[PDB]
Amino acid sequence: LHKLQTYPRTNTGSGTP
Amino acid sequence: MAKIEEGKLVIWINGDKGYNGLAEVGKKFEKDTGIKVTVEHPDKLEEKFPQVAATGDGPDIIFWAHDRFGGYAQSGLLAEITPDKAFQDKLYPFTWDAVRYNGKLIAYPIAVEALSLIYNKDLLPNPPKTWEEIPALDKELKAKGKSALMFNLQEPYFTWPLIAADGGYAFKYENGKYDIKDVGVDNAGAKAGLTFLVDLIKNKHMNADTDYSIAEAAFNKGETAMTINGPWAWSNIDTSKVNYGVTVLPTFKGQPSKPFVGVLSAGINAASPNKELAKEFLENYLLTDEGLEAVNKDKPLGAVALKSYEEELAKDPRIAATMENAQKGEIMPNIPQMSAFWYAVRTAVINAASGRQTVDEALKDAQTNAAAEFPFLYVVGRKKMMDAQYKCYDRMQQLPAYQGEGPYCNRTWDGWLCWDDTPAGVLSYQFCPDYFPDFDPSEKVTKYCDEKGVWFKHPENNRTWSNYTMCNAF
Ligand SMILES: OC[C@H]1O[C@H](O[C@H]2[C@H](O)[C@@H](O)[C@@H](O)O[C@@H]2CO)[C@H](O)[C@@H](O)[C@@H]1O
Ligand SMILES: *[C@@H]1O[C@H](CO)[C@@H](O)[C@H](O)[C@H]1NC(C)=O
Ligand SMILES: *[C@@H]1O[C@H](CO)[C@@H](O)[C@H](O)[C@H]1NC(C)=O
Structure with missing residues (x-):
């Protein structure tokens, strides 16, 4: 498990920029 | 609370450091540049900073040990710092590495902080080399109306050196990166160290409620023969006229106590409109022999990152001891999960010391209590x-x-x-x-x-x- 993987996941799908 | 404002600097630093000395460096800066520098020491500043910086507020410059700074940088809250190589060469390379995060320098190193054993030479002319000898020493001292050892048991920074001695760690480092899947208290060594602490308490050689103030007062009044503290504490001990020494921490199972070493560092708020002034202040006023000396005269920094002044300070045996304990310890990771680690260990130690949980139960919950902290690292600003x-x-x-x-x-x-x-x-x-x-x-x-x-x-x-x-x- 790497340091960015613990964070809540920011949406990057459709309906984002 | 002084507010962020173009053409002045606001600085936060912990209330145990030489904030009045730092303010004097600020006055010298103001004298030369016309730029006012205000130094504040709010409580829990290391917790408050991300939330206030997230909305564009907070100080221009924040001082803390480097272990907090990765969390701030990962949230986009710290300015990249860009010293020239000639300037970089004035500080020890390991101090720069402590403040390097995702390839960038994210703060200026100031001081290299390690805990040492502090002892009263009149009560105890030959301090113990081992933790294991402390119970018998306490028995001997209690017959004289004294005790062997008091130190802060509420903050895990202070108990960590014993936990780490025989195998405690925060996170495994491997293939160039930290693995955060486990906190390194799930080993026999961490358990043995915490068990030793708990046993000191069960055997009435220490009290689970002892905190920084209680320990400090007891040592500085000559009631206890030893304490564990960092160089910032030395001023008050000087005032008390206790005849004290500063020495290597005791060993545990033959292994050095392994303090987590902090590099006291100065970060620039990404939201500051005064980034260039902050750089000028830090590089050309604070990080000079004269600047660090002004801070040191208020409260000792201990060992420092600036080579020229460290070479002068290290003539003092107390400083050489601080560096010996630092080299026997481990530089803290700077990753965002360090705050999670600390919160988990805090609870585990208080719970085990107090008897609210067994050692095994307390260390088991440290894994899930650390992980519980992870979503709260998601702090963002627009x-x-x-x-x-x-x-x-x-x-x-x-x-x-x-x-x-x-x-x-x-x-x-x-x-x-x-x-x-x-x-x-x-x-x-x-x-x-x-x-x-x-x-x-x-x-x-x-x-x-x-x-x-x-x-x-x-x-x-x-x-x-x-x-x-x-x-x-x-
Ligand atoms: O107890 C956990 C706490 O430990 C370290 O904080 C130290 C700090 O480094 C020192 O400058 C001194 O002020 O005492 C503090 C302990 O009270 C970590 O730097 C900090 O993040 C952590 O929460
Ligand atoms: C977005 O980029 C990734 C990485 O190149 C690629 O796997 C994916 O197909 C891309 N998505 C779209 C819809 O373009
Ligand atoms: C692109 O920009 C040009 C010049 O500003 C404009 O005339 C044109 O209508 C724009 N096209 C679209 C598809 O928005």
């Missing part, structure tokens, strides 16, 4: 995005019309990033933005200009869509 938006829409007005030949996609703000006019068929790219802490700013965002001078639309909703998926993949 300022960078909004500055980038404003810049984008301005630049789209001012740039001359496209002078290439053929169909192309128009200049546009996609919501997070700015794009120029792009030829048909080109996959444009730029670095991922640092708005969200699950984003890696060394990864790339792509935006496809299709065959007709039309930007790519996501097929799920047929809306123009830049591709941020590599920013937080895996």
Whole structure:
């Protein structure tokens, strides 16, 4: 498990920029 | 609380450091430049900073040990610092490494902080080399109305050296990166160290409730023969006239106590309108022999990052001891999960010491109590995005019309990033933005200009869509 993987996941799908 | 304001500096630093000495460096700066420097020491400043910086407020400069700074940088809250190599060469390379995060320097190192054993030479002319001898020493001292040892049991910084001695660690480092799946208290060594602490308490050689104030008062009044503390404590001991020494921490199972070493560092708030002033102050006033001396005269920094002044300080045996304990310890990781680690260990130690949990139960819950802290590291602020938006829409007005030949996609703000006019068929790219802490700013965002001078639309909703998926993949 790497340091960015613990964070809540920011949406990057459709309906984002 | 003094407010952020162009043409002045506001500095936060912990109330156990020489904040009045730092303010004197500020007065020298103001004398030369006309720029006022205000130094404050709010409680829990290391917890407060991200939330106030997230809305564009907070101090221009924040001082803390480097272990907090990765969390702040991952949230986009710290300015990159950019000292020249000549300046970098004035500080020890290990101190710069403590403040290097995702490839960037994110603070200026100031002091190298390690705990030492502090002892009353009149009660105890030959301090114990081992933790294991302390119970018998306490028995001997209690017959004289004294005790062997009192130190802060409420903050895990102070108990950590014993826990780490025979195998405790925060996170495994391997293949160039930390593995955060386990906190390193799930080993026999960590358990043995915490068990030794708990046993001291069960056997009445220490009291679970002892904190920084209680321990300090007892040592400085000559009631206890030893304490464990850092160099910031030395001023008050000088005032008390106890005849004290500063020495290597005791060993445990033959292994050195292994303090977690902090590099007291100064970060620049990403939101500051005074970044250049802050750089000038830190490089050219504070990080000089005269600047550090002014702070040191208020409360000792201990060992420092600046080579020229450290070489002078290390003539003092107390400083040589601080460095010996530092070299027998471990530099803290700077990763965002360090705060989670500390919160978990805090609870485990208080719970085990007090008998609220067994040692085994307390260390088991440290794993899940650490993980419980992870979502709270998601602190974000809108300022960078909004500055980038404003810049984008301005630049789209001012740039001359496209002078290439053929169909192309128009200049546009996609919501997070700015794009120029792009030829048909080109996959444009730029670095991922640092708005969200699950984003890696060394990864790339792509935006496809299709065959007709039309930007790519996501097929799920047929809306123009830049591709941020590599920013937080895996
Ligand atoms: O107890 C956990 C706490 O430990 C360290 O804080 C130290 C700090 O480094 C020193 O400068 C001194 O002020 O005492 C503090 C302990 O009270 C970590 O730096 C900190 O993040 C952590 O929460
Ligand atoms: C692209 O920009 C040009 C010049 O600003 C404008 O005339 C044209 O209508 C725009 N096209 C689209 C598809 O928005
Ligand atoms: C976004 O980029 C990733 C990485 O190149 C790629 O796997 C994915 O197919 C792209 N998505 C779209 C819809 O373009």
